[PDB]
Amino acid sequence: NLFQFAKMINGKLGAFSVWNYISYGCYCGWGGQGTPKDATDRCCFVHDCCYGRVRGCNPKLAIYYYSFKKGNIVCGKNNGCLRDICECDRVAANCFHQNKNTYNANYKFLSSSRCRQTGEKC
Amino acid sequence: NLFQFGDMILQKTGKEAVHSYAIYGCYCGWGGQGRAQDATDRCCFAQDCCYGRVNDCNPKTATYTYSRENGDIVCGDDDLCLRAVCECDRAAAICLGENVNTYDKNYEYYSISHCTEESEQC
């Protein structure tokens, strides 16, 4: 669920990190339309595509199991839709951490007028 | 999509969703577990369950057709996925506006250090 996604982000990037992903680019947290603005936004777009492939469970509400092992996110003990959801989150949190250097604070809190309809597909 | 849900929230509550409801309680913000803390949070839990019924529609990125005409929110799609996502958002924005007088800023950014009660069940 989102509670757990937030913990992955914070555990990977540092306390308060998750608040950076509430509304960023066209796809991080909020939004959901347009061409991803940069690599962090692309991580979020891929995460929505990942969530879009999940069937039978609700990605915001499903509680999976994960842990940190020597600072790395490890999904474990998950069956079916819980497995897939955890993996979506794990990969996205890792992708944010990989692309942290190019996070652009001017892409925070974009309005829909900055994210025009495009042909962006999963 | 979430940009469109933000517009409905603005129209019914006067708030900008990315700075308020997006980080509120256990169900409006990044939670998805625990108890809904108040009426606002319970609106969001009902929306989360609503999204859960139309998971395959990919509610985050589903750009639907809606209009505000005469102060009302009207969903215009014939396409059942788009229409249902729009009705989920419409109902949530109506509910949020009905409960704006109990909106409590103590629940902004609250999810990460609370929300561990037995969770609501859709």
Curated annotation (Swiss-Prot), chain A:
It comes from the Eukaryota. Disulfide bonds join 26-115, 28-44, 43-95, 49-122, 50-88, 57-81, 75-86. It is found in: Secreted. The active site is at residues 47, 89. Its EC number is 3.1.1.4. GO terms for biological process: arachidonate secretion; killing of cells of another organism; lipid catabolic process; negative regulation of T cell proliferation; phospholipid metabolic process. It catalyses: a 1,2-diacyl-sn-glycero-3-phosphocholine + H2O = a 1-acyl-sn-glycero-3-phosphocholine + a fatty acid + H(+). GO terms for cellular component: extracellular region. One of its GO terms (molecular function) is toxin activity. SMART domains: PA2c. Its main location: secreted. Expressed by the venom gland. InterPro entries: PLipase_A2, PLipase_A2_Asp_AS, PLipase_A2_dom, PLipase_A2_dom_sf, PLipase_A2_His_AS. Keywords: Calcium, Cytolysis, Disulfide bond, Hemolysis, Hemostasis impairing toxin, Hydrolase, Lipid degradation, Lipid metabolism, Metal-binding, Neurotoxin, Platelet aggregation inhibiting toxin, Postsynaptic neurotoxin, Secreted, Toxin. Pfam families: Phospholip_A2_1 (PF00068). Binds 1 Ca(2+) ion. Negative results: the B chain (not complexed with the A chain) does not induce neurotoxic symptoms, hemorrhage, organ injuries and other macroscopic changes. Heterodimer: postsynaptic neurotoxin. Heterodimer of A (AC P04084) and B chains; non-covalently linked. The A chain (acidic) is non-toxic, and increases the toxicity of the B chain (basic). The A chain may act as factor stabilizing the complex structure and hence retaining its toxicity by preventing non-specific binding. Upon binding to the target membranes the A chain is postulated to dissociate. This is Basic phospholipase A2 vipoxin B chain.
Swiss-Prot record, chain B:
It is found in: Secreted. One of its GO terms (cellular component) is extracellular region. Keywords: Disulfide bond, Neurotoxin, Postsynaptic neurotoxin, Secreted, Toxin. It comes from the Eukaryota. Expressed by the venom gland. Disulfide bonds join 26-115, 28-44, 43-95, 49-122, 50-88, 57-81, 75-86. SUPFAM superfamilies: Phospholipase A2, PLA2. It holds the Pfam family Phospholip_A2_1. GO terms for molecular function: calcium ion binding; calcium-dependent phospholipase A2 activity; phospholipid binding; toxin activity. GO terms for biological process: arachidonate secretion; lipid catabolic process; negative regulation of T cell proliferation; phospholipid metabolic process. Heterodimer of A and B (AC P14420) chains; non-covalently linked. The A chain (acidic) is non-toxic, and increases the toxicity of the B chain (basic). The A chain may act as factor stabilizing the complex structure and hence retaining its toxicity by preventing non-specific binding. Upon binding to the target membranes the A chain may dissociate. Heterodimer: postsynaptic neurotoxin. Monomer: Acidic phospholipase A2 homolog that is non-toxic. Belongs to the phospholipase A2 family. Group II subfamily. D49 sub-subfamily. This is Acidic phospholipase A2 homolog vipoxin A chain. It comes from Vipera ammodytes meridionalis (Eastern sand viper).
